[PDB]
RNA sequence: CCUUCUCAAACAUUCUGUUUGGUAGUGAGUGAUACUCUUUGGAGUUAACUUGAAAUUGCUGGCCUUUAGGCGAACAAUGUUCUUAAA
């Protein structure tokens, strides 16, 4: 495992670094970096791995984005048939039970005709943060979203499932949106030895809660991949050791 | 006065020199054709250069093409002055990855990381806020 | 002109026949006991009546106007180019009133104005506007600016 | 002729499309044949069946030698054929459109179906359809060729062409024999084409086909199948 | 003489429209007159003067069926089954070939019947029926 | 003037739940913190911002095969050749 005291120490002292008087918003945001051997799948991997996390920073994202200029907005991407059967109120009544909200639902037809225009498409995606798409549609997205959508973490889509049986039930979508929203966080899978994972502004969560999220994510990743080390920081601050496995280097050579 | 060398901007997606040659030959035999090209991945910079055998034919092609609506956007072609020459273009391909062997044996970079981690601990006392590990 | 007409053919106006089919459909929909009541969005179509076309000018609302060249009372149309020039509407002189009639469920129209366009064509509309500004306003303004004809036949 | 600057863009992008999809199919079928399923879409294949929005039912493929009759449908709007599909079609003699042929369906034949899926249509024929096809259509190589193979066919043991129907339906003894014996096949065009009344039918079957034929471009595309009893009722 | 026309006033561009007409209400609400026409059709169908289009198609589908429902010797001279007479057929075959076509068709009706297995396949029959149709016409 | 992979399995019965796999980009520019290795040649990654599908020359990676193709498939592999969308 990883010594939690070290991570608590790091988060408190990064709070200290930030307390010293877009970039000004930027210099408070938490970024894990993970060095690991041959993180490639030998191939590009736009698929986002959804790691189980104890706490949900999207609700703090709501509470701070209400004040922020950019408003948090949710995009769901469903088939023509699903949008035909699914209505906005049916989703809204389910989401007010836990107190969240989808901002819009969109079709692939809609993407390929309404937003087949680079400026309009870019503005439409950049407005939003959470991009959800049916796992069936997810395999067809890349030529539609545009590469600029896939460069950034928020703009790239998240895999979500509507079907559980042969046909899809609203219960599956209802609880899968909850699973993706308040129990899962995105993880891009680029090439090279370097991974980056987003947590968010320090001001949103408890630093001890930050630590619990960081350690849960790190041990999940260690169980997943052979990690050279775990380098957490803020994207303005210098770099910080917490943990490292040295034998991974030997395996990297061999 | 102008030359036979020609500049065309705003080229469609997928519209390569093989397509350019097959039309601008129809106006007349051309000495040269090139398109401006990116290195890492085979995608367009949407502009290219032509060169015709006869300047007068080059004038005609420019005249009928200066505002050529095509594939949902307009093309703009302009004749070069007499003092103009073709330079430094090449058909770049998609540059694929490499995996080169790690030269130092295991136990050497074993030492480097312990140095680097311990070193990467030291900038933190230098940055720097009280750290043990 | 070809792409202008391809753009317009998506925005054909509803025929009298199609209008009556939808009317009887919805009236039958009201027929049921157990009827159905719904609210529907705005229609989208070109606009074509001469005084109506000038009406959408002086607002302004015409994002595009096409003017046929062959009109036996040409004085019906001589002002439209200068009017849209001074107003900045992106006018274009199309050639043939009959073809305007074809795209509008009429014999002839002599004018074709469009104001409201869906998001799925808005970028196409803007780029075509820049195109016509490049092909017509730039090319022919200096030869709009001379006396024509005068050569014997 | 001055051809155009526009159709070239359509055919170039459509070739990039056909090339990427056939490449994906080659990856998937090579990995499946070599039994190296580590990171792929699906491990087994599927067959789609459209019948009378219209009901579309899907099944898992059976490694069973099944009789089919291929019908070649006009290719996509602006595509020049890639050479791989060209070779497959030439082997199956599906050039000269409105051309079909009977085929055995086994696992070795099966991967090529995705290769030529955007240029053909599949389905399950009935003996009534097959009988109408042969007794109303079918010719054999010119002059003595037609006679001499009938002798070789007799050496195999076939006579009275109705027995060719029986063996094509049965597949008991030798299908490739009869398959090579029926080397050319031809069907009329369902619409006479040019004319005031006819153009309506052209547009209507264009819409109907656009409803029916589906271009997955997934490489896990379920095999689209149609009721050939209706297709030949139209085309024969 | 002639001179080009000066464009001294067109070059000035007004940034506003000529007239400040207040926008009417009806441009933003669904049109009332189509609703009135709809309700006219509604009262008509309620009285039954107009049949619904679905019921009309049902009536047509039934009525098509209902309308289409209610209403109120040379062969032995010819051989055709292992018989002998057609042994005259190959003897003067060149001779009948040498006659005119309008003689040939009747003269090439007769051909040797080998056995049940083979039937040559009716090269002549369609032409004979077409000629008979013309003879009627 | 074309249209974008719009689902697979296994377990389980909870009136649908759990797990696993499936996604090559629109080009150009700004740019933080940096990460590893390469053996100095730099290479693959990293915050996130701009843009009317915008527009000017960033010189020639490497391996393999054949006479262009794979490195996201090795005895792996690809070319532009469908006519009742004509005349």
Author numbering:
A (entry chain K): 31 to 51, 71 to 303
B (entry chain o): 88 to 220
C (entry chain G): 87 to 239
D (entry chain t): 54 to 105, 127 to 214, 227 to 322
E (entry chain s): 239 to 310, 331 to 395
Structure paper excerpt:
Eukaryotic ribosome assembly involves the coordinated activity of more than 200 assembly factors that assist in the formation of small and large ribosomal subunits. Here, we report the cryo-electron microscopy structure of the yeast co-transcriptional large ribosomal subunit assembly intermediate that serves as a checkpoint.
The most prominent feature of this particle is the Noc1–Noc2 complex, which is responsible for remodeling all root helices formed by the 5.8S rRNA and domains I and II of the 25S rRNA (helices 2, 25 and 26). The Noc1–Noc2 complex not only binds to several critical root helices, but specifically encircles helix 2 through molecular shape complementarity in a non-sequence-specific manner. Helix 2 is a crucial root helix of the forming LSU: it contains the 5′ end of the LSU pre-rRNA, and initiates the formation of the polypeptide exit tunnel, one of the essential functional centers of the LSU, which is formed in a tightly controlled manner during subsequent assembly stages in the nucleolus. Further, we observed an unprocessed 5′ end of the LSU pre-rRNA that extends beyond the B1S cleavage site, which later generates the mature 5′ end of the 5.8S rRNA. In accordance with this data, the structure of the Noc1–Noc2 RNP indicates that the assembly of this particle likely serves as a checkpoint because the Noc1–Noc2 dimer interrogates the formation of root helices that form the core of the nascent LSU, encapsulates helix 2 and stabilizes the 5′ end of the 5.8S rRNA. Thus, by various modes of action, including steric hindrance and pre-rRNA remodeling, Noc1–Noc2 serves as a central nexus that stabilizes a co-transcriptional pre-rRNA folding intermediate while delaying subsequent post-transcriptional maturation events until transcription of the entire LSU pre-rRNA is completed.
